[PDB]
A paper describes a structure:
Members of the myomesin protein family function as molecular bridges that connect major filament systems in the central M-band of muscle sarcomeres, which is a central locus of passive stress sensing. Our data reveal a dimeric tail-to-tail filament structure of about 360 Å in length, which is folded into an irregular superhelical coil arrangement of almost identical α-helix/domain modules. The myomesin filament can be stretched to about 2.5-fold its original length by reversible unfolding of these linkers, a mechanism that to our knowledge has not been observed previously.
Although the structure-based sequence similarity of the five Ig domains is generally below 25%, all Ig domains except My13 belong to different sub-classes of the C-set type Ig domain topology. These interfaces involve loops that form the C-terminal tip region in each Ig domain, and residues from the first three helical turns form various specific interactions that shield the N-terminal part of each α-helix from being completely exposed. We refer hereafter to this as the “IgH” segment, which to our knowledge has not been found in any other muscle filament protein with repetitive Ig or Fn-III domains. Whereas long six-turn helices are found in the My10–My11 and My12–My13 connecting segments, the corresponding helices in the other two connecting segments, My9–My10 and My11–My12, are slightly shorter, with about four turns each. Because of the smaller length of their linkers, My9–My10 and My11–My12 show limited direct interactions in their respective Ig doublets, whereas in the other two doublets, My10–My11 and My12–My13, the neighboring My domains are too far away from each other to form an interface. The right-handed superhelix is defined by almost constant twist angles of neighboring My domains of 26–27°, except the arrangement of My12–My13, which has an average twist angle of 68° and thus appears to be less regular than preceding parts My9–My10–My11–My12 of the filament.
Residue numbers in the entry: 1141 to 1404, 1409 to 1447
The structure:
């Protein structure tokens, strides 16, 4: 049957508990420490009610080490006991503390990356969130909010917490913290973006954002090169992508339109019987409402 059984309640309160089903109108609980009566001890309290007892420690510490025993009079004369040694003192103190001040578990800490539009993603993963969980966001020890600049999402099912930015200004260098609060539980994760790390990220954001826009338009996959063909003609060549019907393709030599394209992603201009007269700065421009691109190439005919 029964032993003495320990309990730590939601408020950190530590206690030993006992019940006996075989009591008599004259039966009584009596507790001892190291086989001396604990009656009158300032370190603890007892409460008996019907067939149950509880001993509540007032402030568990090192002066409470020992064997606690419970005897019941008018029974079989057998005592139940519980050992409190130095290792069990630690375990119970840790449990009390974590009840009073629980921690919200974290699977991975606050990290920062560059997504595909050149968008900046700040993220972390908690182990689990209730539906009441909330976050506050902090940059250089000041609170920041949902608006034109910071946009924030929390999925409570997976514990993914996110903040998005469109780019990194110079004034965005510094320290970022997510502060998490679920019940009476609590945590925070922090990331430092200073120096090399910060401009590593800011440079990469910039480049990808530009690239992504250029590419929604009609654009180059290979820039202007040259070769020789036929009877001493020069052909100019490039490669293009994302070409529509209304797309204007236009050639120039020294600021002066020469040819307008329409025919057929290879683009060529043929230069007939090449000489000094054919030298100059050549360029091709691509255009419509989705954006414009450009390739340039300089041609010397012996200067």
């Amino acid at each position: 049957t029964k032993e003495v059984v320990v309990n730590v309640d939601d408020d950190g309160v530590i206690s030993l508990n006992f019940e006996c089903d075989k009591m008599t109108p004259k039966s009584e609980f009596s507790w001892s420490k190291d086989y001396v009566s604990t009656e009158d001890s300032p370190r603890l309290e007892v409460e008996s009610k019907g067939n149950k007892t509880k001993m509540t420690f007032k402030d568990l510490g090192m002066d409470d080490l020992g064997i606690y025993s419970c005897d019941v009079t008018d029974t079989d004369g057998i005592a139940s006991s519980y050992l409190i040694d130095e290792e069990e003192l630690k375990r119970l103190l840790a449990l009390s503390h974590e009840h009073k001040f629980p921690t919200v578990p974290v699977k991975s800490e606050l990290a920062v990356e560059i997504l595909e539009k050149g968008q900046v993603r700040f993220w972390m993963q908690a182990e689990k969130l209730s539906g009441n969980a909330k976050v506050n966001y902090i940059f250089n020890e000041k609170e920041i909010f949902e608006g034109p600049k910071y946009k924030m999402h929390i999925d409570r099912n997976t514990g993914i917490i996110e903040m998005f930015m469109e780019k990194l200004q110079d004034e965005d260098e510094g320290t970022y913290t997510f502060q998490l609060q679920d019940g009476k539980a609590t945590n925070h994760s922090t990331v430092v973006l200073v120096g090399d790390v910060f401009k590593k990220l800011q440079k990469e954001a910039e480049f990808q954002r530009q690239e992504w826009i250029r590419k929604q338009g009609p654009h180059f996959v290979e820039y202007l090169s040259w070769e020789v063909t036929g009877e001493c003609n020069v052909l100019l060549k490039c490669k293009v992508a994302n070409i529509k019907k209304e797309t204007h393709i236009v050639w120039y030599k020294d600021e002066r339109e020469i040819s307008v394209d329409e025919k057929h992603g290879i683009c060529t201009l043929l230069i007939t019987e090449f000489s000094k007269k054919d030298a100059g700065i050549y360029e091709v421009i691509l255009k419509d409402d989705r954006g414009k691109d450009k390739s340039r190439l300089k041609l010397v005919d012996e200067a």
